[PDB]
Design a protein around this ligand. Structure first.
Ligand SMILES: CCCCCCCCCCCC[N+](C)(C)[O-]
Lengths: 131, 131
């Protein structure tokens, strides 16, 4: 498996399993998570979640006590072992009850070491479904 | 329509019409086209095709003698009006009836003037089909 595919697959696994230290272990010190790209509830100023401290902070307040499910519908390798794209379905479940789901394209970049430098999501709240 | 969506649709129109100057007019002077991301036939050194002079040369090489079609299977807005992703199928025909086809994720970014700064493709020669 390419470094990008390993990292993205390991990323989904840690998040779903609520593995804080495993998730952060996948990340470069200079990581930027734009989920989604542009201004949204999960990217308030559009500049993304920047650095492992911020990423852990996000996990703590927004993943720790919430159920998240990630379904990979399709994977698109590039001609670089370090860059990859996927069609993912994100399903979130807050206690007690409120659900949201969104389907979008997600891009990942890793550095030479195989650590995630970028995760970028193409979706918006107009595309989201609620229950 | 968003600037990103407008620019991407216009890119498809220009390339299919062999409109070299119209295509270049959609681009920022700092444009980088990575089709695909990473080293390949259409990205010789993996650093992409950089700037309008180089893009014009790329057009002369890979588009001017290509019966090229672009089919948009699906579009994925982000939360930025300036960034968007699509699943595209690019069908080429060249030199006496050779045909190639690739289906992949293509991301586009525009600047504040709505001009394309980045076009990036997730595909590799291994996912290409022929005839
Ligand atoms: C079998 C190898 C042939 C190389 C594939 C043909 C290159 C076509 C490039 C068409 C232009 C693509 N794009 C994204 C700029 O529109």
């Amino acid at each position: 498996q390419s470094p990008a595919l390993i990292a993205s697959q390991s990323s989904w696994r840690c998040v779903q399993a609520h593995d804080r230290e495993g998730w952060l272990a996948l990340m470069a010190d200079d990581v930027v998570i734009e989920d989604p790209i542009g201004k949204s509830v999960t990217n308030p100023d559009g500049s993304g979640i920047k650095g492992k401290e911020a990423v852990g902070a996000f996990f703590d307040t927004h993943i720790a006590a919430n159920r998240l499910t990630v379904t990979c519908e399709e994977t698109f390798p590039s001609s670089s072992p370090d860059e990859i794209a996927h069609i993912l379905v994100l399903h979130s479940e807050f206690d007690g009850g409120f659900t949201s789901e969104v389907r979008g394209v997600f891009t990942y970049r890793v550095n030479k070491a195989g650590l995630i430098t970028n995760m970028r999501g193409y979706w918006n709240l107009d595309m989201m479904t609620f229950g």
